[PDB]
Amino acid sequence: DMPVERILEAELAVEDPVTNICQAADKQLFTLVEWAKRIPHFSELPLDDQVILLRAGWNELLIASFSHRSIAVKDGILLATGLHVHRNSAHSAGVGAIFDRVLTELVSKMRDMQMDKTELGCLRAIVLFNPDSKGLSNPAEVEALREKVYASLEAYCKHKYPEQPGRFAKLLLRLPALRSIGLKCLEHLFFFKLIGDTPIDTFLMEMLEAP
């Protein structure tokens, strides 16, 4: 069974501007491990596959987190360190393109549909249970876990919001934008690591190391 209550409890239990952004990403990587342990059946998987899933989705998992957190603000994002990075601050630092993509494709769309924390956790659970991750000892088991998550999500949507029959599909159609924004974010992190002008902490550095 995959109850949406535990998924929501997992979210509620864990909840130069580029330098401030990288420090917040490192802090949330420690928090991401605690979040994944509270997702049902994740800890029961082999320990090697838990590494594979977290190393493959940490980028999209953390991006979905602060994008939904940034619903409160209108022209910026809310870092987990309590700091706010404004539109113009990211633009003045030369990273306004990906910042605008986060605001228009993710934050504003999350604000438009009033995506609740249960729907956010179910989407992050779907990202976590990625059966296409290379090296999985049993990708069909991870695929079965993903199916139980969006089954509980569709039931939650048709029960909590029965007046919106297309809300379930509208939630899943943000994952392609989450995937593309995540890949562009990895390019930025690799570029700053290659040049070495931005300090990158240990956990964030470990996630950028090659498999």
């Binding site: 320990l47 590494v51 977290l54 190393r55 470990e206």
Partner: peptide, 10 residues
């Protein structure tokens, strides 16, 4: 992947 391994076992 030393940091991720140590946090998952605890």
């Amino acid at each position: 992947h030393k940091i991720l391994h140590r946090l998952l076992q605890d």
